[PDB]
Amino acid sequence: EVETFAFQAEIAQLMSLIINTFYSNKEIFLRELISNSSDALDKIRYESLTDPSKLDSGKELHINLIPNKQDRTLTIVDTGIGMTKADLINNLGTIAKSGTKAFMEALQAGADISMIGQFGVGFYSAYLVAEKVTVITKHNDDEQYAWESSAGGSFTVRTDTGEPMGRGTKVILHLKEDQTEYLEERRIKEIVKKHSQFIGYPITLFVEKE
Ligand SMILES: Cc1ccccc1[C@H]1CCCN1C(=O)c1cc(Cl)c(O)cc1O
């Protein structure tokens, strides 16, 4: 079955702001998502140091970027610690961290949207370039789940039937019509070079044939 949840009020407000505010520097979404993957990878590594068996679900720690022009999706995949169903629901929409209103209060006055990451809500910058975001995740302690939202104040969670991931999180950006530049090899390379040069895990940019 599919479960539908309301975003907490302030998160809905943030998402609307991200979608409606004129802001040309959209590329920062990729930095924020790679940062999130890096943090998740840090966590499973940290845990594996005391209990190595937590890598039984996959020893390699990496980030893959996978453009698909036919589906018009950009997918960020990591083999980080992943999220349980509860982690998913609690951290991707139903609970507003302090940084949510702090950020929007920051946008009032001087701050610009590129600072979003500093408030711990950088995930939502995905809606700078995506009309719908799907998050597939698998944590050692739980089943594989799919989160999805086109904003508008709700998201869904369901058990995922797709290819099993072993462990980690996959963010699938269904790109807006006018944002297909982020499917281009040279454009993604440029952004990763500029914003994510010192990530401590291998980042592989997959290519497509003509
Ligand atoms: C950083 C972060 C913020 C909010 C919730 C969860 C996370 C990370 C740490 C614990 C598990 N995790 C994730 O599974 C994860 C999530 C998102 Cl949103 C992503 O883009 C990539 C990921 O690997």
Swiss-Prot record:
The gene is HSP90AA1. It is found in: Nucleus; Cytoplasm; Melanosome; Cell membrane. ISGylated. S-nitrosylated; negatively regulates the ATPase activity and the activation of eNOS by HSP90AA1. The modification N6-acetyllysine is found at residues 43, 69. Its main location: nucleus. Belongs to the heat shock protein 90 family. It comes from Homo sapiens (Human). The chain holds residues 16 to 225 of 732 of the full protein. One of its GO terms (biological process) is positive regulation of lamellipodium assembly. This is Heat shock protein HSP 90-alpha. Homodimer. Identified in NR3C1/GCR steroid receptor-chaperone complexes formed at least by NR3C1, HSP90AA1 and a variety of proteins containing TPR repeats such as FKBP4, FKBP5, PPID, PPP5C or STIP1. Forms a complex containing HSP90AA1, TSC1 and TSC2; TSC1 is required to recruit TCS2 to the complex. The closed form interacts (via the middle domain and TPR repeat-binding motif) with co-chaperone TSC1 (via C-terminus). Interacts with TOM34. Interacts with TERT; the interaction, together with PTGES3, is required for correct assembly and stabilization of the TERT holoenzyme complex.
